Design a protein that fits this description.
8-stranded parallel β-sheet, globular, homotetramer, 386 residues, TIM Barrel, alpha/beta, binds cobalt (II) ion
Chain lengths: 386, 386, 386, 386
């Protein structure tokens, strides 16, 4: 009955179930949650762990003694429940000081502060056991063309991430970074807008091995992109360090619906890929229970995230294991896709008349791909209509 | 009066002005153009050169003697006009054999043929003087999730591009490749859907220095992305080997409107960036005169591409040179964006109380960015309303 | 096992299964189908009927004796199979004469021809038993602002539809019209771009009762709209005269995927609505088997259209009949949504202190909507995970 | 120098320049503005008037004596400046009670309260001289399919608007309503998502003459629609009662950029249409100065709204008055578009061999539309490059 347990490695941000419901046009619909209560409630649902921005766990502007007490209470809740903290991150977007960015703010003093704020929280993350440190530069970007020279901003972004890599190396930490792309919102355009742009940027860092991506379902879908395809490219690059799961209906504001909502077939193909690839990181939900809901609806929405993942996991596994699907995959030449094109080498390909002079293009063209039968088997498996 | 000359380095594909007007829903509205006539007409408008797919210059399936004659006539037209051929490319999308791809077709024999077809045309491109060889993998992708394992497809794509790099190296050619991303159309999703994804892929090739990107205005805009920002990231990476200029109205089918049409302000900021950066490659137009037009309208639309570039060039230069704009840029801290965040180094930043313990976040937050005044100066310059 | 029969009222256009695979970038991948063969193949799959544009059944430019023979053969196929022809339409988009429109072409002679071409085919439609005559004005619109004065074009569009209404009235036909909106493609913007715009236009015709809409799943989704919501508004207006079923992934070119593909949850909610409302018109598929497919894949894709409708029909009925769902609907106040707001009348509402002076806004605000639990029951029913 | 004066009829919402900068992800960046100060500042810029939601002028939950004092101060500011109040509206979206809607909330008590809250503010609007009463049902809609039966919701929406019409009739007010469509945000899908849907709905009200639309540039652009085309359809219907001017870059969250920003060419064609049509209502700006800005930037952004309208007005008038453009319009048959198709009547069209039997489709097809030359004249006029 698709019941999650901590072995399933499902995690949630404090800010997810804790979202009070404020939007562009609306005041809060729910009271604030104490992190202790969210840890307890999430553990009861079968979650494995929780994640946090600095300012979700310790109110911004807290004294040292307040900080210590917030962390102490949180640690007790983790210990009481067995919940883990696999990932943490910095809030470089809410406070007005970050209105033009953190790491790529035009004001240099703000860039330096953003780095100090991040470093302080890396130390805390490591204390709480986090393996991954996410960075979503939601304020990096512009509403107008003159406001932001993007080459200069990328220079600043590289400096910042290189400094953070120097810092973790200096401390001997085993934490790695995961850069989270988003195309827009809250800035008119955000820098590193997709998985591809973030992967490309990482290759230019001083120590690329320390950095990967944290793609989010809805973010790539805000650019109309295929989220499973982007995850495949991240896996191909060896850079899927973390993932954010939720739902989105296309090219809109970021909806943050529960996982499985939004594009259901994309959710199916995502689960199929993560499971086929043996992704071993957390299945993290970055979602918002709609502001229509009370707390009972918050916990129902969170439970639904995990339930939908588990249903889709079952159906994708059944699809791949079905001998009729295995035959359809061969009929569609998925086996041939996985074979090298020219392991014989360049000269042999050049000398191979079957590749040009004697290639019957019409006979090859006439061979159907059989993709529709394959896809209807996939549909039948998803819907439990076999 | 914004008159182009060959010194402006404007180029056009044969398939642009030569588009007969067939669309998803429509038969041709114009007769076919002889490439000789297009070279002559484009030169009269002040173009610098033309580009071609193999199958635009030599009909698919031509004999050797037909090939020779098509090339001879084209060479005569180039010589008669002084037109250049800076770029060429392969058609790996029209023939039905490529219905599932060229380099990433599931059928291995098709992948090998695609490579042979490409190599044949690289030789021709070099003979005609081309410096850049574009690859738009418009058939690489899928309409359904099971049809294409993207990790396997990227393995095949890397093999193909690595073989092409081995080939040009073996021949001692000074041609470089430019990979053209597109998010969708004609496939439901295309592999390497954006500039970022293509840049990331190139970093995993055996000889990355041989490959860059050929971004197209409308392609990035089909994902709702900021084209100037993506061009900035390509320039930051040293990978803007070629560019395709046209117009697009957002998230639709690829419209291929003349340059300056579609998103006019994005066209302004693009020109500003190319000119500020000293981009020295061709300003290539990959556009389609609308099928409403006769040949007179074809040539008017082509002329408009160049005219709009030159108007925007004038206005962007005036913007950057205006001392009132220079003052506004300082007021908005664009100068500070260009300064290193922490050239003092990590330890100095950690020990700098002005960066954390004594940083007045409220005073920094209160300082307006002055971006709206800057942007209205930009608007006034674009519109000739100063 | 979700087997369709003619009682299910599934219909297909000749141009659907008959699509040869030509796209923006690609030549045909399949040979042409004789309409007789498509009628036979569709009947074997359990279809109820077929639909046609004039020029799909009789090649454009046919002589009277060729026309007669094409119709005779088609009629024999219908008689051999028991297939019906519930709908027909005019091709006012393929021939180059329609490059600026049919009914709203700037050239008046083209507008008059479009009307004559339509009237000729209305007569044929009635002979073949069609109840509905669709009009998709795919060429009505513009790529540029000066090319088309939309008020003038709407005047021309109204004249055309009013003339067609006068014609059917004059002949005593019992056929009604169904206007098909689309937002763009092949024109940069199409007139009457959504269900709403078409509904609004109809209200200004001389005999609105003769006209309704023919909404298409993918067309509304090309504007990012909620297709079930638009269908609900059409049903509310009494104007759902016909419907086109297919799949689409968001804001792209019109994909015409098989029904159930694309946005699966939207397909579920659509079926739920059509069945709840007792829609009694044809379930018509306007789709294209992908050009990757051979004929076996064409028929598999067509079969999948019907299969997916029947699966979704079963799941939506089970959802609505489940007493746990019925309780959840009451918990979410769907019953209260269906009750008049103020059947007591305006003055009673004005005098009702419970509506203002004594309304406890905080108590009402605190009551959760319970929509997430309801939606997860819907998900569980769709996936067969109850 | 494009200086606005009150004769230009530019108006602004209190909530525009008064936006404190809170977004999905961000706290306020500016202090609250007293409405008195905004009236004074806007008048100094040359505005004609201001508009308000109830809760922008009188804080929600105010006592009668607080209400009276807020209104008194506002009235004094209007009198001090000569500013008008042409439009008012109700906030049926911020307070948590409206989390599922106002007029279409599932809770009936909320629907009744929404009506009472609206009626109270209609009285105030009339006292302050407003001619138009806007209704933006931003909370009417859903995030999930089961939560909202749209036919039932439209029944509730019609009841509400019919009651409001009964109310204004009963009081003898000369105020009219303007319904503001939006496709999404804050709800996943909003009811009446476009101009077309709102126009269609109005036709089903009890007294349609009392209601029109208040279209917003960015709202229609959030569906990828052509805003000038939608305005043309509203004008064709006689229903453009008010308009909201701003800027938007395509399919995103609602950006609310200053007018002229976003899609500049669409802004040009909009101004051309409003001025050609002789629209005599307010030119109202519903925009948000970006949260990067301080108050000086707020007023610069507001000034830019008006400046851009005036520049575009000049250029559109010059375009239409240019005899070379007038000749190009005739060459493109815009004159013929404006002539009736068949004033000779149906029978004459049926008997006209020039319309079918003797229509030379190839000769008509061959005649180019000359739209690209026309559009480049339009570009040249916009850019001041003639
Ligand atoms: Co998100
Ligand atoms: Co996230
Ligand atoms: Co293109
Ligand atoms: Co291109
Ligand atoms: Co379609
Ligand atoms: Co259709
Ligand atoms: Co807005
Ligand atoms: Co508005």
């Amino acid at each position: 009955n698709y019941q999650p347990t901590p072995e399933d490695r499902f995690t949630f941000g404090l800010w997810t179930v804790g979202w009070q419901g404020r939007d562009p046009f609306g005041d809060a619909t729910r009271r604030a949650l104490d992190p202790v209560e969210s840890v307890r409630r999430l553990a009861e649902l079968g979650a494995h762990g929780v994640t946090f921005h600095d300012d979700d766990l310790i109110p911004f502007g807290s004294s040292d003694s307040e900080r210590e007490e917030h962390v102490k209470r949180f640690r007790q809740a983790l210990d009481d429940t067995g919940m883990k903290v696999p990932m943490a991150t910095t809030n470089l977007f809410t406070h007005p000081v970050f209105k033009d960015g953190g790491f790529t703010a035009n004001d240099r003093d703000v860039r330096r502060y953003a780095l100090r704020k991040t470093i302080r929280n890396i130390d805390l993350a490591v204390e709480l056991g986090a393996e991954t440190y996410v960075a979503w530069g939601g304020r990096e970007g512009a509403e107008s063309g003159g406001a932001k020279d993007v080459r200069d901003a990328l220079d600043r972004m590289k400096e910042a991430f290189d400094l953070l890599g120097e810092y973790v190396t200096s401390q001997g930490y085993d934490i790695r970074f995961a850069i989270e792309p988003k195309p827009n919102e809250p800035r008119g355009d955000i820098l590193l807008p997709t998985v591809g742009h973030a992967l490309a940027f990482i290759e230019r860092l001083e120590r690329p091995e320390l950095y990967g991506v944290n793609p989010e379902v809805g973010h790539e879908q805000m650019a109309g992109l295929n989220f499973p395809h982007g995850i495949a490219q991240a896996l191909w690059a060896g850079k899927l360090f973390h993932i954010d799961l939720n739902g989105q209906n296309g090219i809109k504001y970021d909806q943050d619906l529960r996982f499985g909502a939004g594009d259901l077939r994309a959710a199916f193909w995502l689960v199929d890929l993560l499971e086929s690839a043996g992704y071993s990181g957390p299945r993290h939900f970055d979602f918002k229970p709609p502001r229509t809901e009370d707390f009972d609806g918050v916990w129902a929405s969170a439970a639904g995230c995990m339930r939908n993942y588990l249903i889709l996991k079952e159906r994708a596994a059944a699809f791949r294991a079905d001998p009729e699907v295995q035959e359809a995959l061969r009929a569609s030449r998925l086996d041939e896709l996985a074979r090298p094109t020219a392991a014989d080498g360049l000269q042999a390909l050049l000398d191979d008349r079957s590749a040009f002079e004697e290639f019957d293009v019409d006979a090859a063209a006439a061979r159907g791909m059989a993709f529709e039968r394959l896809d209807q088997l996939a549909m039948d498996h998803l819907l439990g209509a076999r």
